[PDB]
DNA sequence: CGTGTCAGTAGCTGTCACGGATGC
DNA sequence: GCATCCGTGAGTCGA
């Protein structure tokens, strides 16, 4: 009946108050952390429940078992995971806060390459602004140009030497 | 499952505990499961059946009563003729008074065990007569009689899903009218408790945004940038203390998910849901409540909240004050330089 | 994966003035 | 109705 379904609540509820806060204190030695412990005691009390063979017999220390699979628990919490993370807080002192760096040099590089840019043909600026600006393929800037495949290719090949000549007579290190 | 801020719990002055008439550690005892609270009470259903309902009752006592009194009379009974055996046995007087003295201990343990079940059954009742909603039962044995007797009539909860249901059944401009209707004309000792209370309330009546903010069904995430995890240079990581407590978040409600879905005993899933109550208290503001949740070595994480506190806030540690084209040196006396 | 005889923090108070909500 | 207790604050810049 339905009394037969709460008493394994009433049953659960025992073995809570008899044994959840000696099981919190063992499994605290253990981590150290209260937070983790409840997590233990928790998931060990939902093992014990998922185990009538446990809770059967009461002429039996069933707090040994608790310790046991808490033990084992706390172990399984103690490998790889943990390995490698749990050394270092950024809240905590000693360790140094991640820099970008300026970008001064990109900024300079920038504006001689649209000074270089500027005295470029319509033609080729719109060609090296679309491949490498916007990074698309050859066809591509020739599907949307409406030229032919081996003109990007040849307006690339020679803009490409234009923007070298222009650097090279300002003085731009190679 | 519902969670409350709390920023709006446990930060002084209560802000519920202003809006529901609830007192502080009253409150405290309804989120953490440590006590019921009535949400509602079907009141006519109860005027409707309440001489049945004390007749039954009154049945129940009368036959605890009937059932004690045979067994104190079997008991003494029992005694006196143990009595008379040892003494036609020839025993010496004293052992008789040892005898009669347990025979009298007994026949007081049976009484007094009588007597506890006559006082549980007035307690139920008394309590069931008098159930209005926003009260408290922090017997739990107490409830669960309520609730396997006279659970037609009214509806409980614990937890923060309870203070979500009484927010929804709060009538906004009836308080603040009964507020309002108490400042008008009352005693400054109770007027200015009302005072402030109206001062919580009227807010959430004129602004238009209901109070059911204050308890929570989904919490945000800061960005990963804002907790950034760094690598080290002996191969090991280090996190933020943010990214920690997310995680402690994510662990107990997954874990309650589960509980859920295998429909574990209510023990387990209520005292699942007071953990992820907590995680989210330390996520938001961790040691505001209790110990703060420690880190490796006893170190108090950081929360959220402490981001914005004191000299090391965000505040006045990079917006009050932060700046290139700058430098610093030993300072040196100048004779000959002029004033400017 | 299974788990099953005792099996139970470290640390710590060597701060204080002050105001007001909280509580017997 | 009042003693209790909780929570708040407590210089700035350095290599």
Same mark, same amino acid.
């Given at each position: 009946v339905s009394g037969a379904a709460a008493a394994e609540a009433a049953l659960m509820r025992a073995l809570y108050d008899e044994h959840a806060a000696v099981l919190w204190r063992y499994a605290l030695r253990l981590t150290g952390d209260a937070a983790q412990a409840e997590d233990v005691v928790q998931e060990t009390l939902l093992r014990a429940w998922q185990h009538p063979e446990v809770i059967?017999?009461?002429? /039996?220390?069933?707090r040994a078992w608790l310790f046991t699979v808490a033990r084992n628990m706390i172990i399984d919490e103690r490998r790889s995971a943990r390995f490698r993370? %749990? %050394?270092? #807080?950024?809240?905590? #002192?000693g360790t140094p806060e991640q820099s970008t760096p300026d970008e001064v040099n990109a900024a300079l590089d920038r504006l001689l390459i649209a000074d270089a840019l500027a005295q470029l043909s319509a033609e080729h600026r719109a060609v090296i602004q679309r491949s490498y600006? /916007?990074?698309? #393929?050859t066809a591509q800037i020739a599907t949307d140009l409406g030229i032919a495949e081996g003109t990007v290719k040849s307006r690339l090949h020679y803009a490409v030497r234009a923007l070298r000549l222009t650097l090279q007579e300002l003085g731009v290190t190679r | 499952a519902p969670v409350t801020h709390i920023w709006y719990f446990?930060? =002084?002055?209560?802000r519920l505990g202003y809006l529901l008439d609830l007192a502080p550690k009253d409150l405290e005892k309804i989120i953490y499961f440590a006590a019921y609270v009535i949400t509602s009470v079907d009141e006519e259903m109860r005027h409707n059946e309440l001489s049945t309902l004390e007749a039954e009752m009154a049945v129940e006592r009368k036959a605890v009563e009937d059932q004690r009194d045979g067994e104190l009379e079997a008991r003494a009974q029992k005694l006196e003729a143990d009595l008379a055996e040892l003494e036609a046995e020839g025993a010496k007087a004293d052992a008789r008074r040892k005898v009669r003295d347990g025979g009298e201990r007994e026949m007081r343990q049976i009484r007094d065990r009588a007597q506890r079940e006559l006082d549980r059954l007035e307690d139920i009742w008394s309590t069931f007569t008098k159930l209005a909603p926003k009260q408290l039962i922090v017997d739990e044995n107490l409830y669960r009689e309520l609730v396997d007797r006279y659970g037609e009539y009214f509806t409980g909860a614990m937890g923060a899903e309870s203070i979500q249901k009484l927010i929804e059944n709060f009538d906004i401009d009836a308080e603040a009218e009964s507020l309002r209707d108490v400042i008008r004309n009352g005693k400054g000792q109770k007027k200015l408790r009302a005072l402030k209370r109206l001062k919580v309330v009227a807010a959430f009546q004129q602004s238009? @945004?209901?109070?059911?903010?204050? =308890?929570?069904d989904a919490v945000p995430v800061i960005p990963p940038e804002l907790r950034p995890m760094v690598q080290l240079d002996g191969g090991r990581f280090a996190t933020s203390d943010l990214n920690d407590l997310y995680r402690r978040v994510i662990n107990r409600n997954n874990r309650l998910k589960r509980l859920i879905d295998l429909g574990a005993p209510e023990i387990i899933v209520n005292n699942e849901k007071r953990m992820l109550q907590e995680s989210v208290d330390a996520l938001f503001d @961790?040691? *505001? *409540?209790?110990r703060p949740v420690t880190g490796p070595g006893n170190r108090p994480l950081k929360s959220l909240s402490d981001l914005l506190?004191?000299?090391?806030? *965000?505040?006045?540690? @990079?917006?009050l004050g932060k700046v290139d084209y700058s430098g610093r040196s030993v300072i040196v006396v100048g004779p000959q330089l002029k004033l400017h």
């Open positions: 059967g017999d009461t002429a /039996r220390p069933a993370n %749990v %050394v270092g #807080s950024t809240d905590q #002192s600006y /916007r990074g698309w #393929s | 446990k930060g =002084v002055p209560s238009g @945004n209901s109070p059911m903010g204050m =308890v929570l @961790n040691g *505001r *409540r209790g506190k004191g000299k090391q806030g *965000r505040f006045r540690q @990079n917006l």
